């Protein structure tokens, strides 16, 4: 059969968690 | 086709009074075989057991146009009083006595406990007797404002088990067809209780299928011991 109303949102949530992990390592450094 | 046309075409198809070996039948046997073919064909078509069509009661326009002239609708509000049922809230309604199969079936409810849902058109669900005990307390398959359980019993009766009072009983069934009697029969003889001439009431499309089925039935009748 076929339906993506639950897999699409889980994939989107997985990629959102990856998004937050990626942007949580961003730092504007100091001590130049 | 008319009765004269049934007879003439039937004789032509059997090659009656031809030079080759053939079969000649009386108009009474023509009536008998035509009626038998008619009833067998329409039962097979309703049940979907005909291989040539392989289709159910209203599954295509072909079958619609075949059996459209047998479906009759019936209403009744009279309840048979003295009978024994499987529930206190069980009412009994008489069947028109010419029914073969019930295809649509509905009950209208008149109870003060229905609030503003009075006269709610409730579906009549035919239930087996295995399921009845466990369906009485079912809140999804048992009697309700939107459900009525019907059980067949003796004397052509319908036991409607409902939570609310049932005032009316709407139903649509396949009716008895008028038999195909090609000649007013003598005293004593009759087909389905009919003695005079009786024309087929179905559509002309299926008359020829009835004709060929009757021819095959006649051939089987005369050639089942040879």
């Amino acid at each position: 059969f076929g339906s993506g109303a639950i897999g699409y949102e889980f994939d989107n949530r997985y990629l959102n968690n990856q998004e937050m992990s990626a942007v949580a390592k961003q730092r504007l450094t100091s001590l130049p | 086709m008319t009765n004269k046309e049934f007879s003439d075409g039937f004789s032509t198809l059997l090659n009656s009074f031809g030079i080759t070996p053939n079969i000649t039948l009386d108009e009474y046997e023509k009536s008998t075989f035509l009626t038998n073919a008619q009833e067998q064909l329409i039962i097979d078509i309703y049940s979907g057991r005909n291989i040539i069509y392989g289709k159910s009661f209203e599954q295509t326009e072909e079958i619609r146009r075949y059996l459209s002239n047998l479906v009759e609708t019936y209403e009744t509000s009279t309840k048979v009083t003295g009978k024994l049922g499987l529930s206190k809230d069980s009412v009994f309604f008489e069947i028109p006595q010419d029914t073969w199969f019930i295809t649509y079936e509905v009950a209208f409810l008149k109870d003060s406990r229905l609030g503003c849902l009075d006269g709610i058109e409730a579906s009549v669900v035919p239930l087996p007797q295995d399921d009845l005990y466990r369906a009485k307390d079912n809140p999804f398959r048992g009697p309700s404002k939107d459900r009525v359980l019907r059980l067949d019993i003796k004397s052509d009766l319908a036991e409607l088990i409902s939570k609310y009072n049932v005032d009316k009983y709407l139903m649509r069934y396949i009716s008895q067809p008028t038999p195909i009697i090609l000649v007013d029969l003598p005293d004593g003889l009759s087909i389905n209780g009919v003695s005079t001439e009786s024309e087929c009431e179905l559509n002309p499309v299926v008359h020829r299928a009835i004709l060929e089925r009757a021819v095959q039935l006649a051939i089987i009748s005369k050639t089942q011991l040879t």
Binding site: G2, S3, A5 | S47, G48, I102, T103, P126
Partner: protein
């Protein structure tokens, strides 16, 4: 694009062309309208992003003065409210009630809870506030008795039901578009292929499933009839 183009794209992807089809275009409209909100929430709820202009719709409302509760003296000040119930906005876009001109006026669309307590600031005693009450109407509130003369507003937002807000669509120059199929569907093109894919996946399996086809007072699905 219009409702017609999306609907018939879905139908042609599914090849539901015969009039004797189980799944009618109404199923398509329902699925499209729901999956639109689904996709918009999935894309514009995680983190704040630019919402294009295609996702929005303008409804036009006619306001009527109503008592707070009833006609009593002490039942509080009166409110204006839209004559008809208003669609529910999603919380992803830029909702705005404007006085028939988007580039002018200040009518603030706020939450239901906030509008209980607004205008106590002396400099904010002349600002009209809006919210959708649990009644389903858009209620207006302010401390400046001039607001009660307001007669017409237009509300621009990413409404949660495209069908409802399109039915409440504002009159065009030519005139009203009677048929919903001839109105414009509220979604960006970059979200249209995913939307069609989701709807077509939703109805592909059901399209070829068996039916309870025999009229025999029996359930015929276990036998794959």
């Amino acid at each position: 694009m219009t409702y017609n183009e999306l609907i018939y794209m879905v139908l042609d992807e599914l090849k539901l062309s015969s009039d004797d089809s189980y799944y009618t275009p109404d199923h398509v409209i329902f699925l499209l309208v729901k999956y639109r909100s689904f996709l918009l929430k999935q894309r514009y709820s995680d983190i704040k992003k630019q919402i294009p202009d295609s996702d929005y719709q303008s409804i036009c409302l006619d306001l009527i003065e109503v008592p707070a509760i009833s006609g009593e003296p002490c039942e509080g000040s009166s409110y204006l409210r839209s004559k008809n119930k208003v669609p529910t906005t999603m919380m992803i876009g830029n909702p705005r009630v404007y006085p028939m001109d988007f580039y002018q006026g200040e009518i603030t669309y706020i939450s239901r809870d906030r509008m209980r307590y607004v205008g106590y600031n002396k400099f904010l005693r002349n600002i009209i506030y809006c919210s959708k009450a649990p009644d389903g109407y858009l209620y207006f509130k302010s401390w400046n008795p001039q607001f009660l003369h307001l007669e017409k507003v237009s509300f621009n937002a990413i409404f949660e039901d495209a069908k409802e807000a399109s039915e409440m669509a504002c009159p065009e120059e030519n005139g009203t578009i009677c048929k919903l199929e001839d109105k414009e569907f509220p979604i960006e093109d970059a979200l249209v292929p995913p939307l069609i894919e989701l709807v077509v996946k939703e109805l592909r399996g059901p399209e070829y499933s068996p039916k309870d086809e025999d009229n025999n007072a029996k359930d015929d699905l276990p036998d794959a009839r």
